[PDB]
């Protein structure tokens, strides 16, 4: 029951629905006359909230008033809600019933130990020209397309592929993620990617062991049916909410079967350009991670980052990349839409 | 800021004595205890060879002695050799036919021998047959007194109230360059070196502080050799036993008064002729406090992976030190809570404090519960503490003289050859024919540029 | 003529460009680079190194943000 799709009140037994449909101010459609009057009439024996930690007071108050369910159960990712603000709406549901300790999940392998790391890549002199000169947000590509960041990304991906670790690569920009995945010759998914073209990749990643690394647009910041992976790398450490980043990180990362004895059986990477606006979000992520108890480290260089064949090894290819970045418009350099 | 930040050059016994005159060292080696102090400070390499050679007056050939150590370790043996010779301990003598025989300085030999076995003096020590002293002082009372005195000096650097010290000592703190004279009347101020010293450990602190006293000693007319020998005898003294000021020069009396005021020695009265040496004096040697909480007194800082510091300390001094590099969060009666952060550590860095000082300062004070593990400080903290300085210690300044834009490559290669000839070359660019030379060559090469 | 006393400044290539940009911006109030000599070394007017160290450090901090 959601205006994005056809719905079936007749003989329903479990209505699964979207708050923004139900907490409307005024009817969305005749389909709201169909369902909302019907839903206002039903008395559900139990209400399950999957994202109560994200719903605003007004939408929750409207929903609770409309349904009047006999029991309500609030499911949350984190106790502190981004919409908690002055009033903790949790009391509308009731006390906290239980809290699974991060240590109990890690000690029992339910949630893998995630290696949080940041590749603090030194800024390239040429990119530094453009970084300080470009005060506008077109600067985003400069920290994102630094050869140091690309070469480190390429190595670690090929490393995690050698380990046959399922890995997903995420970025804040269309051109950046495209140029990476294209030059790396790896799958990339975007909004225009048709479901069959998308499923071809997903099935060959979720089940076929050949595809170890896939590239996913900023859409991964939200529900885009992201697959399961053991390693995640942020091409940009620039990003939004720390909790939403942490939510995404846990959503995708899964314990690598049989590797729990290793230092880590899950890995997270976020790539950082030194002396750039990325370092604050990097620092705040670093802090928020250690605050949340996650293990963290910083990376600058590791074996193979220069001992292996990696792109842009010559000044000209670096120049072509930088000129292609400079020739790209602000739109191609701006933050990729999330949808 | 033409050069890098001012660093507190920690000169151990080798660096200090290595600059002294042989006659001074010979006079110093006059006492048996001075020889033992020097000897014990030597590396095990020298320590064994000296002991092995002590009973000979024959100039053993340099090669045979060098052939006492295995091929791979002979290279490391050169370090001890260079030290022993540089420290006048080893003097070459020639075997028949001019072969390089080796001999230890007879004074040093004879004093070590008099140290091990009877000699004309009984270690220059005696009881004077006196009984138990009036107003007996206990070992813990001596330690606390010495501690209190040392704390008062550190408190004086911190500029806290009740830090009672003589102006000559306050002057020395400023004269040594620890307390910066940024304002008239010498109000509490500290240089980078003084902060580094504050974070340094007690034995290295006391050692270098006394080295500055010695550096000013002859400027103050005090007897270097005598004070040093007295200090070494004190380092080899016993806490509970009593020692006498009988037969001490006024120079030693002045130093003894400082030494008493400094809390290294306890006296019944300033004028009394019998005293008890404190733990600090016995422990006054160029050594290391350790890689974790101190053997003599355990650490109290519970450093945690989340950069949170739980220092079980009451001491306003220690607390104030933690405030220099860490951001403090709470004060609790038995424990203090703080966290290390970029800003607060960048405060230490900008004040001129190497991250290793903080790492070691925390290590030496690491609470004993943090022990029983190889790394006492988690790697993430150690790495990020260092990374914070490595973030902002990339710019390295160096004063020099630039030679550029010569008329041809011959000029560059000639000037570079001249820079190579004099070893005054700092850096050069052969593509643009650019050369940087030490400032000493400024006039010499500028004038030569008119001649070439 | 071809001789200057000054300070050799060792910096990484990124801060080489920062020094060049900061000198080009005149952002210490005066020109401070004497010349670029290598990708890692620059020769600088000793008077402005005192200000350079602070303004670079502050701008390195500022560059972290936003």
Curated annotation (Swiss-Prot), chain A:
Lineage: Eukaryota, Metazoa, Chordata, Craniata, Vertebrata
UniProt-annotated binding residues for ATP: 251, 254
Organism of derivation: Homo sapiens
UniProt short sequence motif DEVH box, positions renumbered to this chain: 50-53
Effect recorded for residue 27 to Q: In a breast cancer sample; somatic mutation
Subcellular location: Nucleus
Subunit structure: Component of the 7-subunit TFIIH core complex composed of XPB/ERCC3, XPD/ERCC2, GTF2H1, GTF2H2, GTF2H3, GTF2H4 and GTF2H5, which is active in NER. The core complex associates with the 3-subunit CDK-activating kinase (CAK) module composed of CCNH/cyclin H, CDK7 and MNAT1 to form the 10-subunit holoenzyme (holo-TFIIH) active in transcription. Interacts with PUF60. Interacts with ATF7IP. Interacts with KAT2A; leading to KAT2A recruitment to promoters and acetylation of histones.
Similarity comment text for this entry: Belongs to the helicase family. RAD25/XPB subfamily.
Start and end residues of each Helicase C-terminal domain: 151-311
Processing after translation: Dephosphorylation reactivates the 5'-excision step. Phosphorylation has no effect on transcription or the 3'-5' helicase activity.
Function summary: ATP-dependent 3'-5' DNA helicase/translocase. Binds dsDNA rather than ssDNA, unzipping it in a translocase rather than classical helicase activity. Component of the general transcription and DNA repair factor IIH (TFIIH) core complex. When complexed to CDK-activating kinase (CAK), involved in RNA transcription by RNA polymerase II. The ATPase activity of XPB/ERCC3, but not its helicase activity, is required for DNA opening; it may wrap around the damaged DNA wedging it open, causing localized melting that allows XPD/ERCC2 helicase to anchor.
Descriptive protein name: General transcription and DNA repair factor IIH helicase/translocase subunit XPB
Positions of post-translational Phosphoserine modification: 295
Domain of life: Eukaryota
UniProtKB/Swiss-Prot annotation, chain B:
UniProt subcellular location: Nucleus
This protein's record includes keyword Transcription: yes
Gene3D superfamilies, per database record: 3.30.70.2610
GO annotations of cellular component type: core TFIIH complex portion of holo TFIIH complex; nuclear speck; nucleoplasm; nucleus; transcription factor TFIID complex; transcription factor TFIIH core complex; transcription factor TFIIH holo complex
Keyword vocabulary terms for this entry: DNA damage, DNA repair, Nucleus, Transcription, Transcription regulation
Notes on the domains: The C-terminus (residues 305-462) stimulates the ATPase activity of XPB/ERCC3.
Role of this protein: Component of the general transcription and DNA repair factor IIH (TFIIH) core complex, which is involved in general and transcription-coupled nucleotide excision repair (NER) of damaged DNA and, when complexed to CAK, in RNA transcription by RNA polymerase II. In NER, TFIIH acts by opening DNA around the lesion to allow the excision of the damaged oligonucleotide and its replacement by a new DNA fragment. In transcription, TFIIH has an essential role in transcription initiation. Stimulates the ATPase activity of TFIIH subunit XPB/ERCC3.
Family to which this protein belongs: Belongs to the TFB2 family.
Protein name: General transcription factor IIH subunit 4
Organism taxonomic ancestry: Eukaryota, Metazoa, Chordata, Craniata, Vertebrata
Curated annotation (Swiss-Prot), chain C:
Superkingdom of origin organism: Eukaryota
One Pfam entry name: Tfb5
Subcellular location(s) of the protein: Nucleus; Cytoplasm
Example of a GO cellular component annotation carried by this entry: nucleoplasm
GO biological process terms on file: cellular response to gamma radiation; maturation of SSU-rRNA from tricistronic rRNA transcript (SSU-rRNA, 5.8S rRNA, LSU-rRNA); nucleotide-excision repair; nucleotide-excision repair, preincision complex assembly; transcription by RNA polymerase II; transcription elongation by RNA polymerase I; transcription initiation at RNA polymerase II promoter
Keyword Signal found: no
Keywords: Cytoplasm, Disease variant, DNA damage, DNA repair, Ichthyosis, Nucleus, Phosphoprotein, Transcription, Transcription regulation
Role noted for this protein: Component of the general transcription and DNA repair factor IIH (TFIIH) core complex, which is involved in general and transcription-coupled nucleotide excision repair (NER) of damaged DNA and, when complexed to CAK, in RNA transcription by RNA polymerase II. In NER, TFIIH acts by opening DNA around the lesion to allow the excision of the damaged oligonucleotide and its replacement by a new DNA fragment. In transcription, TFIIH has an essential role in transcription initiation.
Disease: Trichothiodystrophy 3, photosensitive: A form of trichothiodystrophy, an autosomal recessive disease characterized by sulfur-deficient brittle hair and multisystem variable abnormalities. The spectrum of clinical features varies from mild disease with only hair involvement to severe disease with cutaneous, neurologic and profound developmental defects. Ichthyosis, intellectual and developmental disabilities, decreased fertility, abnormal characteristics at birth, ocular abnormalities, short stature, and infections are common manifestations.
Family of the protein in this entry: Belongs to the TFB5 family.
The name this protein goes by in its record: General transcription factor IIH subunit 5
């Amino acid at each position: 029951f959601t205006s994005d799709a056809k719905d079936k009140p007749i003989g329903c037994s479990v209505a699964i629905s979207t708050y923004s449909m139900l907490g409307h101010t005024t009817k969305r459609s005749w389909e709201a006359e169909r369902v909302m009057e019907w839903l206002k009439t039903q008395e559900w024996g139990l209400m399950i909230l999957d994202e109560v930690h994200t719903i605003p007071a007004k939408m929750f108050r409207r929903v609770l008033t409309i349904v009047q369910a006999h029991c309500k159960l609030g499911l949350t990712a984190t106790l502190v809600r981004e919409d908690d603000k002055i009033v903790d709406l949790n009391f509308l549901i009731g006390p906290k019933l239980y809290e699974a300790n991060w240590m109990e999940l890690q000690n029992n392998g339910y949630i893998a130990k995630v290696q949080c790391a940041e590749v603090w890549c030194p800024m390239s002199p040429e990119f530094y020209r453009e970084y300080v000169a470009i005060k506008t947000k077109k600067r985003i590509l400069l920290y994102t397309m630094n050869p140091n960041k690309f070469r480190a990304c390429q190595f670690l991906i090929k490393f995690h592929e050698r380990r046959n670790d399922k890995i997903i690569v995420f970025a804040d920009n269309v051109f950046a993620l495209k140029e990476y995945a294209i030059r790396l010759n790896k799958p990339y998914i975007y909004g225009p990617t048709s479901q069959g073209e998308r499923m071809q990749i997903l099935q060959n990643f979720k089940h076929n062991p050949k595809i170890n690394t896939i590239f996913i647009s900023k859409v991964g910041d939200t529900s885009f049916d992201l697959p399961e992976a053991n390693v995640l790398i942020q091409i940009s450490s620039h990003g939004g909410s720390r909790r939403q980043e942490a939510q995404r990180l846990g959503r995708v990362l899964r314990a690598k079967k049989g590797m729990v004895a290793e230092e880590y059986n899950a890995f997270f990477y976020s790539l950082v350009s030194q002396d750039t606006q990325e370092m604050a979000y990097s620092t705040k992520r670093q802090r928020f991670l250690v605050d949340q108890g996650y293990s963290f480290k910083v990376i600058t260089k590791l074996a193979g980052m220069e001992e292996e064949d990696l792109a842009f090894s010559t000044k000209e290819e670096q120049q072509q990349l930088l000129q292609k970045v400079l020739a790209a418009t602000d739109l191609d350099a701006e933050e990729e839409v999330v949808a | 800021r033409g050069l890098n930040r001012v660093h507190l050059q920690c000169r151990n016994l080798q660096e200090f004595l290595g600059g002294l005159s042989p006659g001074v060292l010979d006079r110093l080696y006059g006492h048996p205890a001075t020889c033992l102090a020097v000897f014990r400070e030597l590396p095990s390499l020298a320590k064994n060879w000296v002991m092995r050679m002590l009973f000979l007056e024959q100039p053993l050939p340099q090669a045979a002695v060098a052939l006492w150590v295995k091929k791979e370790f002979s290279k490391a043996q050169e370090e001890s050799t260079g030290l022993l010779s540089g420290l006048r301990i080893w003097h070459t003598q020639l075997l028949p036919g001019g072969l390089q025989g080796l001999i230890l300085n007879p004074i040093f030999r004879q004093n070590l021998r008099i140290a091990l076995l009877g000699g004309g003096k009984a270690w220059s020590d005696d009881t004077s047959q006196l009984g138990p002293d009036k107003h007996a002082r206990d070992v813990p009372s001596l330690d606390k007194y010495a501690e209190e005195r040392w704390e008062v000096v550190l408190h004086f650097m911190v500029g806290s109230p009740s830090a009672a010290v003589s102006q000559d000592l306050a002057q020395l703190l400023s004269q040594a360059g620890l307390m910066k004279s940024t304002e008239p009347g010498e109000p509490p101020c500290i240089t980078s070196a003084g902060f580094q010293f504050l974070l340094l450990d007690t034995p290295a602190q006391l050692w270098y502080f006394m080295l500055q006293y010695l550096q000013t000693a002859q400027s103050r007319g005090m007897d270097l050799v005598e004070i040093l020998s007295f200090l070494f005898q004190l380092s080899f003294s016993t806490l509970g036993k009593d020692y006498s000021v009988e037969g001490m020069s006024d120079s030693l009396l002045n130093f003894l008064q400082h030494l008493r005021e400094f809390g290294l020695v306890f006296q019944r009265k300033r004028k009394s002729r019998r005293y008890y040496p404190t733990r600090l004096a016995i422990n006054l040697s160029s050594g290391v406090s350790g890689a974790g909480g101190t053997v003599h007194q355990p650490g109290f800082i519970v450093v945690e992976t989340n950069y949170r510091l739980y220092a079980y300390t009451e001491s306003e001094l220690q607390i104030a030190l933690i405030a220099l590099f860490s951001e403090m969060l709470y004060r609790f009666p038995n424990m203090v809570v703080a966290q290390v952060t970029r800003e607060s550590v960048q405060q230490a860095i900008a004040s001129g404090i190497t991250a290793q000082q903080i790492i070691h300062f925390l290590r030496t004070r690491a609470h004993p519960v943090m022990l029983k593990q190889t790394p006492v400080l988690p790697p993430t903290i150690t790495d990020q503490i260092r990374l914070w300085e490595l973030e902002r210690d990339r710019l390295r300044f160096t004063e020099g003289v630039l030679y550029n834009q010569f008329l041809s490559q011959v000029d560059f290669e000639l000037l570079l050859a001249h820079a190579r000839e004099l070893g005054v070359l700092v850096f050069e660019n052969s593509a643009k024919r650019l050369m940087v030379v030490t400032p000493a060559g400024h006039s010499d090469v500028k004038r030569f540029w008119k001649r070439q | 003529v071809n001789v200057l006393k000054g300070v050799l400044i060792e910096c990484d290539p990124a801060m080489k460009q920062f020094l060049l940009y900061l000198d080009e911006s005149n952002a210490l109030g005066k020109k401070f680079i004497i010349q670029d000599i290598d990708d890692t070394h620059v020769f600088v007017i000793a008077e402005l190194v005192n200000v350079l160290q602070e303004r670079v450090g502050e701008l390195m901090d500022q560059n972290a943000f936003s």
